[PDB]
Amino acid sequence: MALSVEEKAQIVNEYKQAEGDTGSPEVQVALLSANINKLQDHFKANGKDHHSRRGLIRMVNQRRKLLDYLKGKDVSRYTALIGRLGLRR
RNA sequence: AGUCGCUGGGUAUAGACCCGAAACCGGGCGAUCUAUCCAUGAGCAGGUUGAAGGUUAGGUAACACUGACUGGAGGACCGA
Ligand SMILES: [Mg+2]
Ligand SMILES: [Mg+2]
Ligand SMILES: [Mg+2]
Question: Which bases along strand B come within 7 Å of a protein CB atom?
Fold first, then answer.
């Protein structure tokens, strides 16, 4: 929950599939990706924060699970999501 | 019966019959050899090996990590 409400409100509308959409995998993956990348700065300065890293790993596993489900449903939608977000490194 | 000479034998102090040390001390001369240093120059054919690093393709949540290409380290190797 390191993302502010403004940042959350910022990225939800760029990845929403329709008005009022906050549960679609694109919003979820984009929500996790922005939080994952933001936390990278914290873990650089705080390298002994093993307890907060457990939460970061969970966000990484959650994003992987969502992308794998999006793989089965619509591969074209999956492809656009990672290209826009720059995943699959 | 001493005393002063002269000559000779002996003695004392002197190198004291001649030659001969290892050494000791004083003043000088030497670092064109050599030992270390200082400054300023010069030399080291040829052939190997293949560190760190880099790039790239992967890979990682990120750091990592892997391959290839590269790179050219070393009181390193063979050898004038
Ligand atoms: Mg000389
Ligand atoms: Mg040598
Ligand atoms: Mg030799």
Answer: 59-62
